[PDB]
Amino acid sequence: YKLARPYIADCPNCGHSRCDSPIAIEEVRGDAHAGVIRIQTSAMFGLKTDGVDLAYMSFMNGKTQKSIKIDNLHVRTSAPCSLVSHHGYYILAQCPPGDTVTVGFHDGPNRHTCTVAHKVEFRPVGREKYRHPPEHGVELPCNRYTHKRADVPFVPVKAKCIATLAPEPLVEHKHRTLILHLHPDHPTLLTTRSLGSDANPTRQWIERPTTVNFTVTGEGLEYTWGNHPPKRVWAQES
Amino acid sequence: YKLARPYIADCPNCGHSRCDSPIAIEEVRGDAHAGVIRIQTSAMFGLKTDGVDLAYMSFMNGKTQKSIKIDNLHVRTSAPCSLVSHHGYYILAQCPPGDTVTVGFHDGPNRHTCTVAHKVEFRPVGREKYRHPPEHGVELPCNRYTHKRADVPFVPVKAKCIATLAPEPLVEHKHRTLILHLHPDHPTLLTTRSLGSDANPTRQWIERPTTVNFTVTGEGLEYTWGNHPPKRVWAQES
Amino acid sequence: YKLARPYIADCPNCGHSRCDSPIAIEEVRGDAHAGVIRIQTSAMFGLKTDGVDLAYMSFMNGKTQKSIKIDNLHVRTSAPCSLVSHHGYYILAQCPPGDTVTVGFHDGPNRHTCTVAHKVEFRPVGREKYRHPPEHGVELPCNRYTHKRADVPFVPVKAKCIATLAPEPLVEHKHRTLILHLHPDHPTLLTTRSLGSDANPTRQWIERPTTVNFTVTGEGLEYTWGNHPPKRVWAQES
Amino acid sequence: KYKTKVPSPVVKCCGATQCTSKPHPDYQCQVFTGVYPFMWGGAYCFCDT
After folding, report:
1. In Å, what is the CA distance from A171 to each residue of A168, A193, A204, A230, A238?
2. Separation in Å, CA of D6 to nearest CA in chain B
3. Is A154 helix (H, G, I), strand (E, B) or coil?
4. What is the Cβ-side half-sphere exposure of residue A72, based on CA atoms within 13 angstroms?
5. At CA C11, angle to CA C10 and CA C14, rounded to 5?
6. How far apart are CA B36 and CA B92, in angstroms?
7. Hey, are the CB atoms on A84 and B17 less than 8 Å from each other?
8. Among A103, B184, C52, C191, which residue has the fewest nearby CB atoms (within 10 Å)?
9. Cβ distance C143 to C34 under 8 Å?
10. Neighbours of C151 (CB within 10 A)
11. Which of residues 131-150 of B touch C (CB under 8 A)?
12. Do B54 and D42 touch (CB under 8 A)?
């Protein structure tokens, strides 16, 4: 279950020259196409004085071992960030960048705050960004950590999050010609290739409303626009 | 109303695992040429039990109608916001990025924050940017709101908004030619056109000491620099 | 000495409907060629009954007053900044720009935060900026401040500065040619010129592994990589 | 780097003061009316003009 303890650990940046802080983020997992973070702190979350809550933590800042409400302890990147669940050494929170986490105390005497710039990143496994949910397109896999305890580590599990598919994918088929009328809001990768014995291998990154014409010989073509796996038309105007 | 108490409202998304919140934002004004935003919403600042004040708020916490002094309970847009005036039903704050408007309680066991999507932009009325008037630089037209309680309602008006000034614009007169040694410390839009029947139709944003020579047909030229009041000559000495 | 008191000062935007606020930084000194800042704040940081402390402050207003231990009051640029010493009216901290400090308290009658960002521009005497001299790489003489406690102001101290350089400056010798295979971990300024009659005055900032060939006289060449005083090789296979 | 010295501006709530020159290297004054915009304060000067 929870085999964690609240304690101080060294953090190279604190609010004073007093750097005897807890809340020092040992590890972070952010390898997802989500926005959520599993944080491993030296301070124990999911134990207050009374034990298990979803919105209280406990700490020893070398000047007071106590617990507080996540109010006095606010996560931030600058603006507040709200935790969701606690699993001992591990915190699970929503805090959109999820690679820059600053945990800091508005508790009682002295201001200990740790900030972490962990090596983990959110990234696409595709050719175009979908590393964080946009409002564009339709979903693709992400990782969102369990919001109940399931071993001290919160296990990473697959989940569904929004993904980029390029804005306004107006296709227009015509004779021997496939014009793709594009009207992105943001840098979208347009890749095309023929599916027949025709060629057209065209990668291009585009921004702003543009057109991109391709040959068709009556033997299909695929165009993926803004990170998709093959979308295909065949044996005509394709 | 201003004296009417906050109430639960649809917004089933918060950063914690409690999401039964107020806030839905009835109306918002923030399509100003200032930096300030007037919000009309339930989770009212400028209202305690005494009615309309300038430094107290009231809120439903998710289920607790109460008032507090503003502590760890923060307004934000896409960045923290420090309020400027509170007027009952209306909040007035300086919120530099705008767009989304987030009213949130960063309390302990129940930590609700609602954000509502809106298009709140701060833009030029001329060609000089506004997004947070400071107290240094020339005052220029903008939209704004009244900043003291009238208990009448806060509604749009136009007021004056500070925008950055730039160093001395060293003019050098010559015959039928006016070279302008300009020395911005900050982005100034330099627009010129002649005040003759010739022209100098040159918009450019400039930064740092440069020279720009312009024609004069014997009727000088107008140059607006930074969108600060025009520096104009009408001579053939120019 | 340590005769400083808490008082108000004019801020551009601070809490309440008047910005004649607490925690408002009157002046800032960036008169270093390091990255360190001596701060003059109306409200006093760094003193409780102890004299010089690291973790208490005081402030007053008329509308949003009290003094606290530094905890609910966080200094930020957007991340922590650590003070080192207090000399009454003067605060001394390591903070990255050394001109922009945002102090705010998230407790009391309102939530006030003042930001100071008024100029006192500086950069190191080299060509790379620091927030305080790091361990990594070459030292350079510079100005900074006193950082030991001794209480009046923390006057400039001629003392070392350090510029980071990148990991591998792989020089490759050939006949009258030096290609510099460089492998940045971080943006390095590479300035070169050949030594001798031939010279190659080429400043460039590079990031990510690249090669850059320069002609060589046969009398040597200088390359400084990552801000150094000349690193030079002489007649050989240079 | 210069350091700006402000001795403190002479403010008259519901009055006015004309500039008196003082010998400093870039001494500059300006007489500024208003100070506080109308309806913008909670214990501000009555006169906002």
Report:
1. 9, 15, 17, 15, 10
2. 15
3. coil
4. 18
5. 125
6. 7
7. yes
8. C52
9. yes
10. 19
11. 132, 134-136, 147-148
12. yes
> Quick one: closest CA in D to B150, which residue?
D39
| Residue-wise DSSP of C32-59 | SSSSEEEEE-SSEEEEETTEEEEEEEEE
Inter-CA distances, A157 with A36, A147, A154, Å? 12, 10, 9
Rounded to the nearest 5 degrees, what angle is found at the Cα of C12, between the Cα atoms of C132 and A77? 50
Amino acid (one-letter) located at A138: V
Residue type, position A78, single letter: S
What is the rounded distance in angstroms from the CA atom of residue B25 to the CA atom of residue B44? 10
Cβ C188 vs Cβ C208: under 8 Å: no
What is the gyration radius of the CA atoms in chain C, in angstroms?
23
- Cα D48 to the center of its chain, rounded Å: 13
Nearest CA in chain A to B113: A82
d(CA C177, CA A130): 46
Gap between the Cα atoms of B102 and B22, Å rounded: 12
Strand ranges across the sheet with A221-225? A202-206, A188-194, A221-225, A232-233
Contact B205, B187 (CB under 8 A): yes
Chain D residues in contact with C18 by the CB 8 A cut-off are: 36, 41-44
For A33, the token pair is 């196409």
Per the CB < 8 A criterion, the answer to whether B99 and B77 are in contact is yes
Beta-bridged to residue B55, according to DSSP, are none
Indicate which of C18, C29, C99, C116 best probes the interface with D, i.e. most D CBs within 10 Å of its own CB: C18
